[PDB]
């Protein structure tokens, strides 16, 4: 580690889900290869799975660029501007299908330590504690061992 | 951004004038304080038991033998009191102490070798700056107005006094000369160990106790003598003849006050209080004030019987 890595407080993008839920995933870029065993799992994902996946999520733009490459990759871009690049080199159809769905659920914020598992903007409703909360008032507000007039 | 001194920019015609100009001002200020009882003196309380009066700041001239009527050769130290004045008074409440503190200076020095803060202090007091300033603990009935000069007549023969001054500094010295260790023999096989401390601690502790006698700087520290009596007082030159030797070299400033020893307590009944005032004295003191047992040089040769 925690000391050796940065950290952030729990938060969302523009208070997602407060009035409506907005899918933070914005773009998917797949780079598969026509020839190459490294993309065997990725090619099967494109042939049967990405078509049905695009049906479920209309707000995410999916690009399938078929070019020669040794390591197929999936690039996910989010609304907040963070870009997450992942490699699907030699992965089964099920492993790719689960990984892509995980990217859809994330908001794009950095995957680092979160200081608190809770975040509230109005933690106090009856008044935040102050040292005079539980102290009774004295007549004329006189101080201890103080004489007036 | 470069420092400067008083006569850096002065021409050949101005340097003698500046030296003479400031010299005349010093003479005037010292000669304008010789009348303390006329320039609104503070009340003079009578002597009381348990009262402490202020001391002086003397300069060690040298040593001179002195013979008594008993025929014993006693050596005394000539302490010259020159340009001794009271600078300021601090009350017991402001002192944060049991006794009231009084400031005394001595040995008028140049005004060109002092800081601005010190110089402006003497500007309002109308006195030339003093080299060494000592603080004396006195009582409420011994207060003295600032600017009042002091003389060697403040003490009398037969009175025991305490002299404080810095000892002669011998620089860095080994244990043999600083603490008097025996050392090692020069012969019988000794190898590069003749004046070394040797063992400094035991092996079990694995450390050296604080305060262990080790080589270091010797001298140049304040040491106070006690139980030194005055055999002779000279009024013309303001010289105190203090028995024995006193800490410090020749021409060094010393702090002089009454003896703190219990055997010499409550002996100031016949001594001047708070101090002697030559301006208002009804009769001028003799040239020299001796002790009962002192055989003066003018007296004939002592003939024991």
């Amino acid at each position: 580690t925690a000391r050796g890595t940065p950290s952030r407080f729990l938060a969302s993008v523009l208070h997602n889900g407060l009035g409506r839920y907005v899918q933070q995933l914005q773009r998917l870029s797949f780079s598969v290869s026509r020839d190459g065993a490294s993309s065997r799992g990725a090619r099967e994902f494109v042939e049967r799975e990405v078509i049905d996946f695009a049906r479920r999520n209309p707000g995410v733009v999916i690009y399938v660029n078929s070019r020669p490459c040794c390591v197929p990759r999936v690039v996910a871009e989010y609304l907040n501007g963070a870009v997450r690049e992942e490699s699907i080199h030699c992965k089964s159809v099920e492993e790719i299908s689960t990984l892509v769905q995980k990217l859809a659920d994330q908001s794009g914020l950095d995957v680092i330590r979160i200081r608190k598992p809770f975040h509230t903007d109005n933690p106090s409703i009856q008044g935040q504690w102050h040292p005079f909360t539980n102290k009774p008032t004295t007549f004329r507000g006189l101080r201890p061992r103080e004489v007036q007039d | 951004k470069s420092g400067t001194w008083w006569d850096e920019h002065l021409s050949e015609e101005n340097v003698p004038f500046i030296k003479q100009l400031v010299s005349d001002e010093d003479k005037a200020q010292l000669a304008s304080k010789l009348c303390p009882l006329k320039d609104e003196p503070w009340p003079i309380h009578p002597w009381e038991p348990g009262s402490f009066r202020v001391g002086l700041i003397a300069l060690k001239l040298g040593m001179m033998p002195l013979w008594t009527k008993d025929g014993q050769k006693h050596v005394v130290t000539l302490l010259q009191v020159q340009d001794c004045h009271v600078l300021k008074y601090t009350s017991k409440e402001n002192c944060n102490g049991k006794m009231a503190t009084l400031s005394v200076g001595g040995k008028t020095v140049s005004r060109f070798r002092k800081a601005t803060s010190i110089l402006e202090f003497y500007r309002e007091l109308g006195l030339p700056p003093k080299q060494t300033v000592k603080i004396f603990n006195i009582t409420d009935n011994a207060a003295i107005k600032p600017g009042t000069p002091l003389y060697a007549a403040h003490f009398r023969p037969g009175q025991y006094v305490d002299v404080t001054a810095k000892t002669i500094g011998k620089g860095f010295q080994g244990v043999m000369k600083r603490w008097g260790f025996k050392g090692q023999p020069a012969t019988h096989g000794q190898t590069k160990t003749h004046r070394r401390p040797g063992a400094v601690a035991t092996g079990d502790i694995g450390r050296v106790w604080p305060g262990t006698k080790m080589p270091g700087k010797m001298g140049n520290i304040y040491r106070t003598e006690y139980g030194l009596k005055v055999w002779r007082i000279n009024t013309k030159h303001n010289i105190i003849y203090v028995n024995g030797s006193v800490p410090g070299h020749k021409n060094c400033l010393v702090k002089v006050k009454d003896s703190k020893l219990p055997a010499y307590k409550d002996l100031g009944k016949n001594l001047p209080f708070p101090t002697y005032f030559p301006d208002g004295d009804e009769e001028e003191l003799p040239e020299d004030l001796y002790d009962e047992n002192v055989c003066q040089p003018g007296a004939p040769s002592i003939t024991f019987a």
Binding site: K135, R143, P144, R145, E146 | -
Partner: protein
């Protein structure tokens, strides 16, 4: 650092600046027992005597 925020005074005299910024006087932990001369006659007479001394006892 905590010892710097602790102020001790041998007597009841307190400097004005320290006295002018006090807030609450914490109660004393131990309740001071009353001396025999501080009891009023109402409480002394309320407490019953347990024994009757003989009239011929010098005491």
């Amino acid at each position: 650092t905590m010892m710097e925020r602790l102020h001790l005074f041998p007597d009841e005299y307190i400097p004005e600046d320290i006295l002018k910024n006090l807030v609450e006087e914490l109660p004393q932990p131990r309740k001071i027992p009353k001396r025999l001369d501080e009891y009023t006659q109402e409480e002394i007479d309320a407490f019953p005597r347990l024994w009757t001394p003989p009239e011929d006892y010098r005491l």
